[PDB]
Structure formats: C-alpha cells, structure tokens
C-alpha cells in the first residue's frame, strides 16, 4: 500500500443506382421458364448501373472555317472554360493574324481533341463514383462505408475456436 510499492506493483504486472428488373418474382419466373426454354411476357435485362455515355450528340468538331474559306484560300494559294483557358482580347487576335489556312484544319481538330478529352474525363469520374457504389450494394454493404442465418454468415461459422490447454 506504500507509494514506493504502488508504482512498482502495476509495473511488474500490468494487469436508383442499378438497372435490373427490381421485381423479385419476375426474375425467378424468367429462370423457371428459361430452364424449360420458354419466353415470358415481361422483359428482363442484365444488371448494370444507370447512365448513358452519349457522344456525337454533344460537343462536335467546331467550324472555324466559313462556307467557302477553304476553296477561296485554295484559289488565292493559302482558368479553363471547358479545356482551354480564356485568352485576352488583344493577345489572341495577333496570334490569329499569324496563322495560315493550312493550319486551321489542324487547330479545329486540336480543340476538338481537348473538348472530347474533358467531356470524357468528367464522365469517367462520375462513372467511377457510380461503380464504387454498385460494388458495395451488390456485396451486402448498405452504402458508403423470422430470419435464420446460414453458416456463411459473418460470425456464424460451424468451426468453433478451440482453446489451448494452458488457456
């Protein structure tokens, strides 16, 4: 009980995201007739996530040339908004007073290649955010983390932990 011993006694001993058929009775009736080899009335798709990757009904190749700015050039022998930073009024104007219509067709495709890459990057990010919630939903996790349990339940195994004799 003395404080020379109390400090040493404890020292010596320390002691809307999927696109399946959500009805859980038409999927079973589909397989019950599919094993026979029969169609059914309703439709059933495979499971997936929602969302459409719709290109070419979106950002197009721009039209930097006029209706005849190439054939007339043929006769006369010639920070970011989406992916490109907005240029100042005076600095870009002398830059576009330098170029030639041999490079206008280059510039159109360069700017289209920037636009399509940004429009694929953001949709790719949204798609990864959707698949990370698909895989959690299909594995029993809710999101973002009389019943009878089967032996394949978390904590309901049949192989009980056997204890060693010294314990």
């Amino acid at each position: 009980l003395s404080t020379n011993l109390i400090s040493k006694i404890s020292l010596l001993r320390p002691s809307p995201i999927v696109t399946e058929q959500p009805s859980a009775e038409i999927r079973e009736a589909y397989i019950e007739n599919f094993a026979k080899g029969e169609h059914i009335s309703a439709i059933v798709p495979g499971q997936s996530i929602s969302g459409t990757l719709e290109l070419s009904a979106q950002f197009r190749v721009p039209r930097y040339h006029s209706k005849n700015s190439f054939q007339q050039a043929l006769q006369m022998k010639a920070q970011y908004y989406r992916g490109l930073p907005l240029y100042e009024k005076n600095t870009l104007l002398e830059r576009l007073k330098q170029l030639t219509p041999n490079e206008i067709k280059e510039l159109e495709h360069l700017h289209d290649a920037v636009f399509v890459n940004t429009g694929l990057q953001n949709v790719r990010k949204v798609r990864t955010k959707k698949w990370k919630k698909y895989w959690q939903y299909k594995a029993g996790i809710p999101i973002g983390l009389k019943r009878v349990p089967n032996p394949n339940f978390l904590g309901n195994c049949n192989i009980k932990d056997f204890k060693p004799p010294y314990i």
């Binding site: 009389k146 019943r147 009878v148 349990p149 089967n150």
Partner: peptide, 5 residues
Amino acid sequence: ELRNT
C-alpha cells in the same frame, strides 16, 4: 433461410 412461424 427464413424459417417462419
């Protein structure tokens, strides 16, 4: 398994 009463 859903053993009900």
